[PDB]
Design a protein around this ligand. Sequence first.
Ligand SMILES: [Mg+2]
Lengths: 495, 535
Amino acid sequence: PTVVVMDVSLSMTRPVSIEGSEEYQRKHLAAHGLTMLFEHMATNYKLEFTALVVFSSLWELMVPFTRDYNTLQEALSNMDDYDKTCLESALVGVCNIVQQEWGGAIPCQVVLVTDGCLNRFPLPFPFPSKLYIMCMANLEELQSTDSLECLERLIDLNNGEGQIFTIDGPLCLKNVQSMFGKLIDLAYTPFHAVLKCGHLTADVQVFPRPEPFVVDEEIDPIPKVINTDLEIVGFIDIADISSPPVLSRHLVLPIALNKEGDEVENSANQIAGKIPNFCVLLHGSLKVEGMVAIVQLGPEWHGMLYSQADSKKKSNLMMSLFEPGPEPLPWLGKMAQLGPISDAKENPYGEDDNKSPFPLQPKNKRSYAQNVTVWIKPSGLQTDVQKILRNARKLPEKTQTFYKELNRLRKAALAFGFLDLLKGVADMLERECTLLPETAHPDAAFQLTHAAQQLKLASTGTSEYAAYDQNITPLHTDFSGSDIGVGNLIIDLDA
Amino acid sequence: EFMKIFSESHKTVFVVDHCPYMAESCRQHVEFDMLIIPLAPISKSLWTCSVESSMEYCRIMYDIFPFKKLVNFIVSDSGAHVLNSWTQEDQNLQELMAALAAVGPPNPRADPECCSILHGLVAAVETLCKITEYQHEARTLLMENAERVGNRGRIICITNAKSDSHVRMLEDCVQETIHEHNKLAANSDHLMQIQKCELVLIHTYPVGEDSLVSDRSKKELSPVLTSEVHSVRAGRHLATKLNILVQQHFDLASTTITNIPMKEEQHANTSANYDVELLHHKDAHVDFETITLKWCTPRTNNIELHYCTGAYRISPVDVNSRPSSCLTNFLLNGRSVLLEQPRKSGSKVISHMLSSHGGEIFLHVLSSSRSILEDPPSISEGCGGRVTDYRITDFGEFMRENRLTPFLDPRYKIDGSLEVPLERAKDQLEKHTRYWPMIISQTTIFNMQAVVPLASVIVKESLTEEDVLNCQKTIYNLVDMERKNDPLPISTVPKRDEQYRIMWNELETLVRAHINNSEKHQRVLECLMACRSKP
Ligand SMILES: [Mg+2]
């Protein structure tokens, strides 16, 4: 986005030429320069949002962020007589305006039009920003009053992000046009690329123009720009890409070019509309198939093309850029090792297209995907205790989990050096054996005391079952013949 | 010199005291018997408290940072024992639990000659000078064009100190040891000097006593060494301290997911709302001391592809608690859950998503703000948008047939030559698009079921003997169709004589596009040329 900050103070009513070379006041060349900017936007950068703020004693937002460059254009003739109400710095207003719409991660350009006449300070802007100052005063005038050094400080406070534009010469219309022309070339020229899928190609614009990325000012300082040949290398199902983190998102839109590289009117998009275009084919298929197209942005840099996923909005073709590098998404693995199905032994996606090779899993399990023992909270000890008891009662049906739970508590107790716990459990177990009901399978008592005895021998530490590897086994007894509140919690998908 | 990921986080050294005094009781009783005469409430050794707190710190770190954040765990009694190394392989909690079990609890009735925490403090300073694998990799890549890779570490020491005087002697011993050993690391090629070290001295003592050690704020002892001192009771206070410390050492924030509706499957009135607290890198809250995000109940008609500006691994605070284990396994079983940032604004704000990927749970940062790409131009108003007959479903099959799949090695042989998987994918797209008309009215053969057996294999780089037969059989059938004068789909989207001439010309165009692939391709064309009708 762009916020135009337009000075409507009295000084701007001064003539551009006391010699009468031209009749304009400063505000008139300012509006002429902005008209040039809005006209360029309206035809070569249509998707850009622009707001218009005016300021003198006070400031006011006159036009909220819009793509309607007519309303922005019409605002220029009516901006001196617009009621300003707000009483902070207009640059404070710019900050509030920008984040209130786009948040604080979106690059905004702030175009300050003025003659220069001379809590958290607003600069540097809290979002990625350029501050472009269009001086409606010439260099000799700015120098003659130290106003030039103030303006130059603003760029310094915005960490040199932005530029002062000045005229060293007569403040006339040709020179102001030349000046806004330089701003246009610097900050509003579309980014043109070629979208390729093998031999299928389309000339496209990538909007907004992606910002040049720097990885690590020490380890890799060269700014990265995406290749202009956007080569599709393969397709991946939306469910496998699984909402990856990306640097930024862009519309990818076809453009009608001429022999001279000329984007070509009330009749030109008519004949362009009847020429089949690979963007439309790709976009439509991507939506219908629910897929993304993986695209190479440069050596070891990839991204994806896809269609709008909310079905209630307009859709068109979009591109997100991944973080540069050889493995941005763990679950896909290294991009360069993604290959064609034809080269695989079996079809990874299944004979009935019901499987997927994705996601890859990490080499080692995280702790929530794997049993871990944590006894800092007394709740966490009790639950491991009640777990061992719940199964101790259900013997011999559950000797497996009984002895799995039991050996877990044994191993953790030896790791932590919590040997008192071993005697304590062993005592609970032998109480259970005592308290057993006379309907119990006879094997329950043999296992409970054998467990309670082996657990106390591990308290001894005296290299018995005290060894970490030495698990407690059930007795091989030859019997030949015939959760309430402490169970798992589940997710209540009602209400 | 610089630190990138080679800050102090890279190398953390634990030094826990294993001297006989550590066997004393923290005196914080534990109730291991919930519901006759309950058993005697037991208590942990100061040693056990220290090993618990340090292992939980290591769990949280290992979840949030499974790579490039390393730990050496050292126990000190009469000597130092380093239970693992810097290698990422040796960064395994389970192997540590085994090592700790093998050193065992301190012997109260032992008199190990010349035992003190100082043995391990030296060992800490020594291993900080051994190169990690990532350090060794960066030196070998940065060449002598740098080899200014930073080497900074942290030493966390849990002990029972005697007095404030005693603690200061330890600082000075570390201070001199870093100074003397750095000289060795200098004239050593296999060792790196310590450019900065942070020392955390944690004095822990049983509940009920008044510590003889007082907290001392961070102090710069050395150009290399900074040092701080905490007094904290053993048990839950020591545990809380290392939880605060893990968040500070690794730039973590806390998020509690609120209002998770849960219940017990074997109950009725069990329906209830629960809260779970997660740790992750602080960057997850940049767009926005715990941040609350409200659970949003999943609608099965949800968006499949979300715009995500970042994804951060999590570790649950209470990993074995019942409500966290519920949230965790829900995610692990494939479900995703959207999170709302509470605002009395009214406009509900979905700021985050929780999703597991191959068993690893990420917190995805979503977009709450208006999109600069909103209201895009209409496809119909742009280039080619007045074209009605795009081969969309045919091209979707193209996509399904060119889905990517991960291969294990960086390369694999094809014709005795090693190829890059993604290169071979890109090459296949080239072959599949040498002849691929985008719209129905521009093709005859791709509207014909009879041509599929040929068109679907002729683009391969070699043909099986079965592939060849099906190619000839397709051609033979087209001769039969022409003889029966079957109508062909060249229609609006003339003379049948012309229909077939056109159809054959297009089939020849397709085949000729591939005769350089293989000699069998060449023979398919000879068959076509011989069986088709020529003007
Ligand atoms: Mg003024």
